[PDB]
Ligand binder design. Sequence first.
Ligand code: SUZ
Ligand code: SUZ
Lengths: 116, 115, 115, 116
Amino acid sequence: CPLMVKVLDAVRGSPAINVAVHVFRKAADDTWEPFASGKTSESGELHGLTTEEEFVEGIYKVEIDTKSYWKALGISPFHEHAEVVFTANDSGPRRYTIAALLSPYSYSTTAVVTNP
Amino acid sequence: CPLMVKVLDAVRGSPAINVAVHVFRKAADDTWEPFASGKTSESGELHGLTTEEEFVEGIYKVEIDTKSYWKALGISPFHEHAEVVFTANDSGPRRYTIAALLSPYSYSTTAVVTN
Amino acid sequence: CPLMVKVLDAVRGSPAINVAVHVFRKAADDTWEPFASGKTSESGELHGLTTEEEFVEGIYKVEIDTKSYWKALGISPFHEHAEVVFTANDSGPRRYTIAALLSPYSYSTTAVVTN
Amino acid sequence: CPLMVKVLDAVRGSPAINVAVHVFRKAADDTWEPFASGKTSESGELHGLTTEEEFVEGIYKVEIDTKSYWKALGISPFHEHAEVVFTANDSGPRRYTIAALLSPYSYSTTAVVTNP
Ligand SMILES: CC1=C(CC(=O)O)c2cc(F)ccc2/C1=C\c1ccc([S@](C)=O)cc1
Ligand SMILES: CC1=C(CC(=O)O)c2cc(F)ccc2/C1=C\c1ccc([S@](C)=O)cc1
């Protein structure tokens, strides 16, 4: 599991559950190609987005669907999404945890990059 | 000044100065159209991006070139940039401050929407 | 204005207005001594807490009554308050902005230390 | 493990390892009484601070020694510490995760409160 996404809800102080996460990889033609997607679990975690084999060097965009998340909670959020864009694996494979904290009008994303 | 961007540096505890910021508006074909840009001032602020007349409802993207900022400081950044995407809604409150706090491996953004 | 506190609300996307802020200085006996306090203005800012003369080097605590703020909004808060503790050092940069972003179950604070 | 502390380093994009964490509980006399303390592990996590039996209702202060953490990394940080103060267990036992993200001049703390 080289790429994991963890989402917390700062309003409820809970995992942000059932958050849609779309991962894209910048293609040769500089377009975003869909790479992987998934939903955060009850732990606010999204595991198994990709594999060591599939998660090659690239510029990746992780788009966290914070908007749908807040709407489903009956809240009108400010942001369309939380999107983290980074070069991955440029000095060899790393494991990346994208940790996002969500408020209706604010998010932060932190990356935990570890060398397997 | 309907749209303001303020950027702070969490590492140096300062405004994030000379950070390139590009604003895009989502065009009908779902592409991002350059709308406005600038560099944050010495207060880490970027004013005069747009005017009330130009700042119509729509989906906006505020792309903060965090990576160049960190490179300029000789600090290894994680993100390619910070991208803040939001719907400008005329409804109520109408001046938007997009606040960003930058760390090499983390960024946070908040919207201050006021009258 | 050597010490400024700015507070934002991450839930409402606004300045956190009328937030009580108490500043303490660590006394020699390691107790916190009331130093300054105020309520954030409508810009979520609290100015005029102290003066250059009164703001000597030392350890300061900025206690933001986040709990009363959230209760006033009818929102259930986690923290009792937000406590920002730091050393004011004369050395270099010398105006301190203590920025706080409040969520019910989260707060963040950043220091903007400038000239 | 009703109380856990997780600390990340936003500069290095890593767990904040060997971070001293002191937990205090407000006593009857309104003083802070030492409750528990520990160090974050290599995962930036601090488990086993307390027990279900020991972690009674109270106002607790979790003081994360961010200053020593940054100093040990040769960085001069702004804050003396990151200290989270909260009423715990007021509607029965909860599990509390105090998640802190550290930068030299900034921290955030989020609470993940779950009902066992
Ligand atoms: C640019 C900026 C400002 C402007 C100013 O200081 O005048 C600000 C003011 C506050 F009261 C709180 C946060 C901010 C901010 C960026 C920011 C800080 C923390 C977070 S949290 C960690 O998600 C997010 C964004
Ligand atoms: C999802 C998440 C976790 C879960 C985990 O890593 O186990 C976490 C753990 C920490 F020790 C610190 C932060 C986080 C986090 C998101 C996050 C929180 C605050 C900020 S501040 C507001 O910039 C940014 C991101």
